[PDB]
Amino acid sequence: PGSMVSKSIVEERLRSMLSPQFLKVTDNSGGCGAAFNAYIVSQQFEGKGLLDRQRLVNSAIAAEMPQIHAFTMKCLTPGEWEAKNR
Ligand SMILES: [Mg+2]
Is residue 84 a contact partner of residue 33, using CB atoms and an 8 Å limit? Answer: no
Distance 68 CA to ligand 1 centre (A): 5
Q: Closest Cα partner for 54 from 66, 67, 44?
A: 44
Report CA(60)–ligand 1 centroid distance (Å). 15
The structure was resolved to a resolution in Å of: 2.0
Distance 59 CA to ligand 1 centre (A): 14
Report the first-to-last Cα separation within the chain, whole angstroms: 35
Say whether 40 counts as a known binding-site residue: no
Instruction: Please report the domains of the chain, with CATH numbers, ordered by start residue.
Output: 1-86 (3.30.300.90)
- Burial degree of 36 (CB within 10 A; 0-12, 13-18, 19+): buried
Element (H, E) at 71: strand 68-76
61 annotated as belonging to a binding site for a ligand:
no
Give the integer Cα–Cα distance in Å for 5 and 49: 28
Taken in order 17, 22, 50, 54, the sign of the CA dihedral is positive
User: Residue 69 C-alpha to ligand 1 middle, in angstroms?
Assistant: 4
Q: Is 52 helix (H, G, I), strand (E, B) or coil?
A: helix
